[PDB]
Amino acid sequence: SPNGLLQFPFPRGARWHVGGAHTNTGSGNYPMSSLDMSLGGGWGSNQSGTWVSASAAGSFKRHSSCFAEVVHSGGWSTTYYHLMNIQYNTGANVSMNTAIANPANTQAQALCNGGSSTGPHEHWSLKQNGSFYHLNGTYLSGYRITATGSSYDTNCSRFYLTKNGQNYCYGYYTNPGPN
Ligand SMILES: [Cl-]
Ligand SMILES: [Zn+2]
């Protein structure tokens, strides 16, 4: 995703935790399409005010009660997994920063289509032409992503976000919007 196309998939102005890039399944080192993002709280916590947000405007796909996709321009799409309280149905037009769901606050709901999770979060992925895309060299909220390690690697020489020449390791990020 080129610089300016996508914002972080959480509210503009909010400050959420961003983990290391990983493949969709969490094993291997390619394509590292995915990032886990959360605000806080474990299983059972109140996530009803924690709003997973559309990375860009596009067309909504509600795959299940825990899994959504937004189809953007240019063959790009973003996907959002481990959800509850999805706010749109398939075919809806959503905007950049539209609140689309909460992170599922129970494991059974978070894993409604399989997988594993240690706690409430969104598993966000970038796709191009319907295939998982490798995040190295892509942009998110104006940060250039470097991802050259294995899944979930947070070593700050192999996973970091770069903006205005400064590198930033994994951790909490305030969402400025797409730039
Ligand atoms: Cl709708
Ligand atoms: Zn994940």
Residue numbers in the entry: 1 to 179
Sentences copied from the publication:
The crystal structure of the Lysobacter capsici VKM B−2533T β-lytic protease (Blp), a medicinally promising antimicrobial enzyme, was first solved. In the peptidoglycan of target cells, the enzyme digests the bonds in the interpeptide bridge. Apart from hydrolysing substrates for proteases, the enzyme is highly efficient in digesting the peptidoglycan of living Micrococcus luteus Ac−2230T and Staphylococcus aureus 55 MRSA cells.
The active sites of LasA and Blp were almost the same and represented a groove, the walls of which were formed mainly by four loops (1–4) and the bottom by antiparallel β−sheets (β3–β4–β5–β7–β2). The active site of Blp contained a five−coordinate zinc ion by conserved His 22, His 123, Asp 36, and formic acid, which was replaced by Wat1 and Wat2 in the LasA structure. The C−terminal subdomain and disulphide bridge Cys156–Cys169 were preserved in the Blp structure. The conformational lability of the Cys112 side group in the Blp structure was implemented in two positions, one of which did not form the cysteine bridge in 41% of cases. Access to the LasA active site was more restricted than the Blp active site due to the bulky charged side groups Arg60, Arg68, Trp41, and Asn20.
